[PDB]
Amino acid sequence: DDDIAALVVDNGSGMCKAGFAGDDAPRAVFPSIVGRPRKDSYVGDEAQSKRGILTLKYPIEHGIVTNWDDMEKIWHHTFYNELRVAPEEHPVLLTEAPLNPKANREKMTQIMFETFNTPAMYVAIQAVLSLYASGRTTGIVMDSGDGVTHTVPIYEGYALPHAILRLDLAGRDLTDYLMKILTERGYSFTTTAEREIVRDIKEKLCYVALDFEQEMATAASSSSLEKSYELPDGQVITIGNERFRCPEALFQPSFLGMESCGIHETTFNSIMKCDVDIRKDLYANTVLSGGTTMYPGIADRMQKEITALAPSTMKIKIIAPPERKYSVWIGGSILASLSTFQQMWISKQEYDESGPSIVHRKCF
Amino acid sequence: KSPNVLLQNLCCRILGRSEADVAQQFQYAVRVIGSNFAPTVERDEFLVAEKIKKELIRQRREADAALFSELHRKLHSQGVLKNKWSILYLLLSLSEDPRSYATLFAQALPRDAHST
Amino acid sequence: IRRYTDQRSLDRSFGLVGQSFCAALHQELREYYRLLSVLHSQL
Amino acid sequence: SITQLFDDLCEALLPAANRKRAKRSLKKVAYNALFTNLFQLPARNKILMLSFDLRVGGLGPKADRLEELVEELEAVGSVLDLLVQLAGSGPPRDYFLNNKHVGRNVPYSGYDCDDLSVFEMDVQSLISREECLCHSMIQETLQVMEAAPGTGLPTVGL
Amino acid sequence: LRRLLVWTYDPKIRLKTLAALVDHCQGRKGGELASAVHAYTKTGDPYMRSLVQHILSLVSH
Amino acid sequence: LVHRILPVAASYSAVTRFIEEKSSFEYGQVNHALAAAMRTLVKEHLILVSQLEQLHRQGLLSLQKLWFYIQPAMRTMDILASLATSVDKGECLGGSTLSLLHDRSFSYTGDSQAQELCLYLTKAASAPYFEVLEKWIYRGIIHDPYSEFMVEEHELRKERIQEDYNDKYWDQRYTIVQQQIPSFLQKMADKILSTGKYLNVVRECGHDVTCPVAKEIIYTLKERAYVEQIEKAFNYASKVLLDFLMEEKELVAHLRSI
Amino acid sequence: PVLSFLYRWIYDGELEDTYHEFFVASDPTVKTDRLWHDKYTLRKSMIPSFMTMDQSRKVL
Amino acid sequence: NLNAVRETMDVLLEISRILNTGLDMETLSICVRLCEQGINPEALSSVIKELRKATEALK
């Protein structure tokens, strides 16, 4: 190149993504599973392989850390076994979840400087870092992950946390609710492995439609909507009518029995807390993001809701990348490539001279 | 100024309506003034003065025909303008009565005896 | 080559393909005459 | 995706026959200048303003071609504001002008004799192309006739 | 300009045709003259046709 | 070297006589406009000689440079010179002189310079011909100041010429010439006579032909518009004549009485 | 020009010359209804070498 | 839409070719898509102009 190489390692909420900044795809995708018997010093590929008598746990699930030992441990074993590189030749951009406390930022930076060992560091809010890859510094990001989902409004490179609305409904609630309805109707879901496999089936094959009612009536008069998949496991679970209406609980809390805010109302309440002069400027760049693009078709519903959200006397102008599975990755990958970003990136010496809390101060 | 936007300044002068409220009149003016912007005629503020007299005599105010003769003296007394023909010929073009024939009256050369 | 393309220029029973080959040969010999033209002034 | 759209911009505008590290370093400059700007009257009117400057320099039907094409181009407005900035920077016959012996419905205006002397400059341009070529054959060899052994030749460098 | 052969080629055809009408008509007066211009309006050359196309409009006023 | 340059002067010396002589009245009506369209290419030939002499003053022109320059004219004028000598040698007027150009316009297509000169010359020269074609086809009147058209007129509706003294006027009164077809209306030659035959026996009844079609005939090559044009007019004339025949003085009643 | 002849042998029409630079060698006086058999002999000598036999026979 | 967007791309190719822009077909389609996302044109005008100087010092 012309300068010292970059590194981006973000421990997300269902996965750890690593690699060198300057690639469209991450170099390495790992699980964020933490091993404990239901290994104990080996985490990642080995813990996911010995799963079945080993618990599945993520160190962050609500967008705030539930157990600090697990995060510090997966972070240290990320640096020691998964990559095995020299720290002084790889500055790392870390990304914590949005709406993390200031003490969490202090905890992340002490841990990144001591157990993880980096020569200069930066920790950022997630969806903002993703939007900086979308070629603008203004916009609204609806980020939907494994653990939670949240609409981050971001104007001029900065998210006000008062207008970031956290919503529980995510892929975990979708899988949990699938398990609940199949086992309530009568189906053996039994073990944690079969749980993971049926989650794989929902993630990959599922047909998601924009109209439920017409497709429901056609499937109820003559069912042919199915498409069978028989794995090396041997299980055959498919039904066409349930798989498009199972994620409808995102805008319909009464499908479980829940009383909650829906997704359109969440983004409505979020846009209410942004100023109306920047509402147009933000509305001129609406992004599609989130790992739920493993099957596209929820994204069409998402863009219909953002068209209906603001008043239509101006046409939607939507930034739709060819892939948004790696949205958080391509987010940090643009940032660590920048050379002017080294002046807003904090060193070890500034971290030592002005306390550990200056990572909350330097980070805008 | 730059001559392209300077037309739009006139178009926004007469009607105060925006340059996004109408675009055909403005297009019609970029049609008409371009290829008729640079002169293809030989200039004469002399000949135009001698018909400005003939216009103000036609309104039968002889003192004002002598008032223009002094204002024209002032115009040369300063010497801050190069093309003194054009604006007077313009204001002559927009003449109007506050209260025949012209091809037998002098007009300038259309460059049919001079070409470069 | 000058000989060859000169007899086929006034040979019009040489057909529509041969009179295209010869039309190309005209243009190549034009470029061959360009050089001697520059050399003549230098003489 | 957008991290590739500046890189594909970087490849197409780079020709070929170092320059293998430079592409990857120039997409870095592409992002480094994207966020220098972001930190710190219709669209068709600018096209009308450039067509006017065509008409002042002659070439009327060309300006009329520009405008008949932007009237159908109204059916992109964020592309033209970029297009007008690269319309000034560049890279680093017809027989019906003066003929009346064709047609049956053909104008009568008589003579012109106001640009018929600039109808002979029409021929002066053609002869001025084929005389500037013979000036660019005599110089590229007169730079060779006066030279010295192995000053531009690396064959002495062996 | 090689004795201005360029500028002398626009005449010597417009001039020639109008040297004929003033020979061909040598004393006709009345509608016998508008029969002597209406026989030049069916000449196959579009130069000469367009030139007598305006002469006939003038004389028939 | 001065022998090598003479063909372009030879292909000029045999055209200027042609342009002067065959634009006189006696040579047809199309032989006029043919020579009149070769005047545009002589203007260029004049400005060449002048511009060359103006380069000669500073000594930046010589024989070899000029020999290098005169190469496009040596071909382009040679085409028109052969055309001029061939029309002069024979009696090519009307359709025959418009057939020759239609032959040269195919004899070169693989170069497409020796096509373009002829393809322009054809549109230019056939203005008077298509103006005869603009009368016979859309009206039941034809004029032809110089009768050398493919249709030829005779007058056999007269004071002493009777309905059984001319019998049937189709192939007798209005007749078609075989060699004055310009060899691209040959495909429609029968129709070209019959269209204008139909139109005049409608002029006898009604006030005028009253045509809605009225389109200008232009030259094309390779997909002809001047065939589709003839087809539309040939439909309208027969429609009007048939409508008139079965409505007024109807042949149902006249045969029923027989 | 060969591919120009081939535009009158991918559409209706017929090249006529005595220069014979095209593989079609037409046969007069047979237009009865049997010309879907034989009206067009395939002259091999005017077939170009950038056209295969498969190319110079399907066009027939 | 697709035929109309093909036609509007073609007309957009013609008016940038007679204005003699250094760009080509592919980079036009790239720039058109970048403005179709909502990216500021004022920033793309810098990167094209600095690339088109900086790529020649390499060759």
Place of tokens 């006898």: F204
Neighbours of B89 (CB within 10 A): 20
Q: Are strands A286-287 and A318-319 parallel, antiparallel or unpaired?
A: parallel
Q: How many Å lie between the alpha carbon of D83 and the closest alpha carbon of chain B? A: 18
Which letter, b or e, does each residue of A285-315 get, where b requires 16 or more Cβ atoms within 10 Å of its Cβ?
Answer: bbbbbbbbbebebbbebbeebbeebbeeeee
Place of tokens 């019906």: D96
Burial of D155 (0-12, 13-18, 19+ CB in 10 A): exposed
Contacts of D134 in chain C (CB under 8 A): 34, 37-38, 41
**Contact state of B115 with D114 under an 8 Å Cβ cutoff:** yes
**Contact state of D25 with A137 under an 8 Å Cβ cutoff:** no
CA pair distance A177, A173, nearest whole angstrom: 6
CA pair distance A280, A138, nearest whole angstrom: 11
Task: Give the three-class secondary structure for E48.
Answer: helix
Q: Token pair for residue G36?
A: 């879907």
- Ordered by where they begin, the domains of chain A are 5-126+328-364 (3.30.420.40), 127-168+262-327 (3.30.420.40), 169-260 (3.90.640.10)
Q: Token pair for residue E53?
A: 């196309």
CB A97 within 8 A of CB A126: yes
The number of C-alpha atoms within 13 Å of A119 and in the hemisphere containing its C-beta is: 11
CA pair distance A31, A45, nearest whole angstrom: 7
Task: Give the torsion through C-alpha atoms of H47, H50, H51, H53, to 10 deg.
Answer: 160
CB A326 within 8 A of CB A293: no
- The angle at the Cα of A242, spanning A240 to A244, to the nearest 5 degrees, equals 80
Q: Are strands A15-19 and A7-11 parallel, antiparallel or unpaired?
A: antiparallel
Q: Is F118 on the interface with D (CB under 8 A)?
A: no
CA pair distance H46, A175, nearest whole angstrom: 48
The number of C-alpha atoms within 13 Å of F51 and in the hemisphere containing its C-beta is: 23
CA pair distance B107, B47, nearest whole angstrom: 8
Q: Token pair for residue H13?
A: 């190719």
CA pair distance A322, A299, nearest whole angstrom: 12
The resolution in Å comes to 8.1
Contacts of D69 in chain H (CB under 8 A): 11, 14-15
| Beta pairing partners, A150 | A143, A166
Contacts of G2 in chain C (CB under 8 A): 17
Contacts of C17 in chain G (CB under 8 A): 1-2, 21
Distance set, CA B95 to CA A50, B55, B83 (Å): 99, 8, 20
Among A282, A1, A25, A338, residue whose Cα is nearest residue A142: A282
Among A265, A258, A225, residue whose Cα is nearest residue A241: A225
User: For the packed helices D2-12 and A327-337, what is the interaxial angle rounded to 10 degrees?
Assistant: 50
CB G26 within 8 A of CB G39: yes
CB A132 within 8 A of CB A157: yes
CA pair distance F136, F146, nearest whole angstrom: 15
Residue G48: phi, psi to the nearest 5?
A: -80, 155
Strand positions, DSSP E, A169-323: 286-287, 318-319
Contacts of D129 in chain C (CB under 8 A): none
CB D72 within 8 A of CB H11: yes
Q: Given a contact as 3+ CB pairs under 8 Å, which chains touch C?
A: D, F, G
Residues 75-94 of D with CB under 8 A from H: 75-76, 78-79, 81-83, 85-87, 89-92
| A181-188: long-range pairs with CB below 8 Å, 24+ | A181/A242, A181/A246, A182/A237, A187/A237
Among F213, F177, D23, residue whose Cα is nearest residue A22: D23
CA pair distance A205, A222, nearest whole angstrom: 21
- The angle at the Cα of D143, spanning D138 to D146, to the nearest 5 degrees, equals 120
Contacts of residue F105, defined as CB under 8 A and 6 or more positions apart, other chains included, come to F115, F118, F119, F122, F221
Q: Is A285 on the interface with H (CB under 8 A)?
A: yes
Residue to mutate among F108, F183, F221, F222, with most G CBs inside 10 A, is F222
Task: Give the three-class secondary structure for A191.
Answer: coil
CA pair distance G51, H2, nearest whole angstrom: 37
Among F18, G5, F79, residue whose Cα is nearest residue C9: F79
CA pair distance A52, A192, nearest whole angstrom: 6
Q: Are strands A15-19 and A120-125 parallel, antiparallel or unpaired?
A: unpaired
The DSSP-derived string for chain B is --HHHHHHHHHHHHS---TTT--HHHHHHHHHHTTSSS--S---HHHHHHHHHHHHHHTT-HHHHHHHHHHHHHHHHH---S-HHHHHHHHHHT-------STTS-----SSS---
CA pair distance A322, A319, nearest whole angstrom: 10
Q: What 3 state SS string does chain F have?
A: CHHHHHHHHHHHHHHHHHHHHCCCCCCCCHHHHHHHHCCHHHHHHHHHHHHHHHHHCCCCCCHHHHHHHCHHHHHHHHHHHHHHHHHHHCCCCCCHHHHHHHHHHHHCCCCCCCCHHHHHHHHHHCHHHHHHHHHHCCCCCCCCCCCCCCEECCCCCCCCCCCCCCCCCCCCCCEECCCCCCCCCHHHHHHHHHHHHHHHHHHCCCCCCCCCCCCCCCCCCCCCHHHHHHHHHHHHHHHHHHHHHHHCCCHHHHHHHC
CB D84 within 8 A of CB H13: no
Q: Token pair for residue H15?
A: 């008016």
Contacts of residue D41, defined as CB under 8 A and 6 or more positions apart, other chains included, come to B19, B20
| E33-42: long-range pairs with CB below 8 Å, 24+ | E33/E59, E34/E59, E34/E60, E42/F143, E42/F145
CA pair distance A345, A122, nearest whole angstrom: 6
Task: Give the three-class secondary structure for D3.
Answer: helix
Q: Is H2 on the interface with D (CB under 8 A)?
A: no
- The angle at the Cα of G52, spanning G47 to G54, to the nearest 5 degrees, equals 110
Phi-psi region of A188 (alpha: psi -120 to 50; beta: other; left: phi over 0): beta
Distance set, CA A135 to CA A338, A350, F117 (Å): 13, 30, 56
Radius of gyration of chain H (CA): 13
Side chain identity at residue A41, one-letter code:
S
Contacts of D106 in chain E (CB under 8 A): 46, 50
The DSSP-derived string for A315-327 is ---EE--S--TTH
CA pair distance A14, A32, nearest whole angstrom: 6
Q: Token pair for residue A139?
A: 């916009």
Which H or E run includes A11?
A: strand A7-11
* Contact flag for A and H (3+ C-beta pairs < 8 Å): yes
CA pair distance B18, A4, nearest whole angstrom: 54
In total, chain A counts a number of residues equal to 364
Q: Token pair for residue F218?
A: 């232009």
